């Protein structure tokens, strides 16, 4: 009876991609209609061996063309007159903002990522992913854990002192383990049709053109309501969960103070709820207790993909424009044209039972 649950009604106000660690490469999707289709490529290969095209198909996956739509899998169907859907059935619709808006380059996307799913096929946001977003809010807005952390004591600096929040069995003394007493459950498995497959857009202060990037994360469409059960046992983990309305705003206000300053206000959008950042999006300042990582964090990229002289680069999408119209008037949901959202910007509200 010491348990007391919560209902974190997560509302996506941004493209949110989560998980699965694997990717559909190029030549593994067909742009037949104005909707994508991701077959089972073992089942695709078995039908095509029966249609006697396997030597042509391996000769298809070696030669490039100056055009790009003839280097996708739909050209192998039209040059050999394939007339069935019939494969490992998974298909999403599209918007037109996936590829370059110009028609010639349309449907020539490459290397989409995947979204985490169960073995049934219906996607969900897992509880392990939603809990890592809560932990950074609970990291950065305590004054006791955001101290001079990340003592290496050996070798190279990136070693965070993970033994700063008590979590182990800790022999002799009594088991406290705060994060054992915060128990984030998974989502309900929602539908495939809220997936829009955005691409990542980098935006810096200098070089004001927002450069494209060939990431093609299949993300959740915004304005989708996803609920979570978060059950807490003890008093200390009990109090830190309804406090999140004052913790996530205090996180984001400290996170508006830099990396959301020094930018135009056009690309950044409003909050309208309690803000939170899920995975695979704006990172390294959201997936980071950020005050002690700024000096340290840029050491890892003295490379060709060099992290800039400033803090970092803004992470952006191009998703279809929607409004909520919840305040007096239609809430404009952006401060620009041309469909820029920032990736991973979620919102929630919390309530017991």
């Amino acid at each position: 009876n010491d348990y007391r649950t919560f209902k974190l009604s997560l509302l996506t106000l941004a493209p949110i991609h989560i998980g699965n660690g694997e990717k559909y490469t190029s030549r593994e999707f067909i742009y037949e209609n104005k909707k994508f289709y991701f077959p089972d490529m073992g089942k695709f290969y078995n039908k095509m061996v029966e249609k006697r095209l396997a030597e042509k198909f391996e000769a298809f996956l070696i030669q490039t063309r100056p055009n790009a739509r003839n280097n996708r899998l739909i050209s192998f169907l039209n040059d050999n007159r394939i007339a069935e859907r019939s494969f490992g059935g998974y298909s999403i619709s599209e918007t037109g903002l996936e590829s370059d808006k110009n028609p010639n380059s349309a449907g020539a996307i490459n290397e989409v990522n995947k979204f985490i799913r169960d073995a049934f096929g219906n996607p969900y946001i897992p509880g392990s992913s939603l809990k890592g977003a809560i932990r950074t809010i609970l990291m950065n807005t305590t004054p006791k854990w955001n101290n001079e952390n990340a003592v290496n004591d050996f070798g190279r600096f990136p070693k965070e002192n993970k033994n700063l929040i008590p979590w182990g069995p800790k022999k002799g003394k009594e088991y406290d383990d705060l994060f054992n007493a915060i128990r984030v459950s998974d989502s309900k498995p929602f539908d495939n049709k809220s997936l829009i497959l955005v691409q990542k857009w980098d935006y810096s202060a200098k070089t004001n053109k927002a450069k494209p990037l060939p990431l093609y994360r299949e993300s959740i469409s915004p304005l989708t309501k996803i609920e979570f059960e978060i059950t807490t046992t003890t008093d200390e983990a009990g109090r830190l969960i309804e406090e999140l309305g004052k913790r996530a705003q205090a996180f984001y206000k400290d996170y508006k103070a830099f990396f959301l300053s020094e930018f135009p206000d056009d690309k950044i959008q409003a909050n309208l709820q309690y803000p939170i950042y899920l995975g695979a999006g704006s990172g390294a300042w959201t997936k980071t207790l950020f005050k002690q990582a700024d000096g340290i964090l840029q050491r890892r990229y003295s490379r060709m993909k060099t992290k800039m002289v400033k803090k970092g680069v803004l992470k952006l999408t191009k998703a279809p424009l929607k409004t909520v119209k919840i305040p007096s008037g239609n809430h404009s949901l952006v401060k620009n044209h041309e469909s820029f959202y920032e990736m991973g910007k979620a919102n929630f509200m919390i309530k017991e039972i």
């Binding site: 985490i116 073995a119 950074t136 984030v184 059960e229 990172g283 990582a293 964090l297």
Partner: protein, 217 residues
């Protein structure tokens, strides 16, 4: 007078539980933390020890005043049903937790199932410097329904209590729904439901008509 009482509940998952083992020769870039399977059928199972370890350790905060340091210090309502090795008369007490193997072998199929165990990639993200540390753990899939087969054991010592020793069974079948049935538990991993309980008498001609109707509240 001697009697045995069987409880054929059905353990249906909502978040997929991870009762681990260790495949010692696992692989690189594969499941480095598997679930325990049935050794022939390779279906994921729930052992009775993971059930009995979560029945007792959740009823040791409810039906145990002067909270126990060891399992030998349980305050002799819990030791009467879960056994107590440091006692003259409580060794092997009256409950047998049979393993819940699998029931819906072909009801999970015709929903679309490649394998009966899903694989989840999980990534300990270092907060400072954003280092990544992935892990791949197995889970029994969402709508998997297991065969709970708890067996009660009536001697001539049981007299008045018989029925007192089922509210602790009914609450153990209820305090675990508010918790996880093992697992990398904090994140999801066994938020489980104990559906359609049914007590029957499998030996000794004992009546369970008044016994069933206190398991439906």
């Amino acid at each position: 007078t001697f009697a045995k009482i069987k409880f054929s509940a059905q353990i249906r998952l909502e978040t997929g539980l991870h009762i681990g083992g260790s495949d010692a020769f696992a692989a690189i870039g594969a499941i480095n933390s598997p679930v325990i399977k049935d050794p022939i059928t390779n279906l994921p199972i729930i052992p009775g020890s993971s059930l009995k370890g979560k029945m007792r350790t959740l009823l040791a905060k409810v039906y145990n005043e002067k909270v126990a340091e060891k399992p030998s210090d349980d305050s002799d309502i819990l030791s009467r049903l879960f056994g107590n090795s440091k006692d003259k008369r409580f060794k092997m007490g009256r409950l047998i937790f049979r393993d819940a193997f699998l029931s819906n072998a072909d009801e999970l199929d015709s929903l679309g199932v490649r394998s009966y165990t899903e694989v989840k990639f999980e990534n300990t993200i270092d907060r400072i410097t954003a280092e990544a540390n992935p892990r791949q753990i197995e889970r029994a899939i969402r709508n998997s329904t297991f065969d709970f087969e708890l067996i009660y054991e009536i001697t001539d010592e049981n007299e008045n209590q018989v029925e007192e020793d089922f509210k602790v069974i009914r609450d153990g079948l209820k305090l675990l729904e508010l918790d996880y049935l093992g697992g990398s538990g904090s994140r999801g991993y066994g938020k489980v439901a104990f559906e359609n309980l049914k007590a029957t008498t499998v030996f000794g001609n004992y009546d369970v008509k008044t016994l069933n109707e206190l398991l439906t509240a």
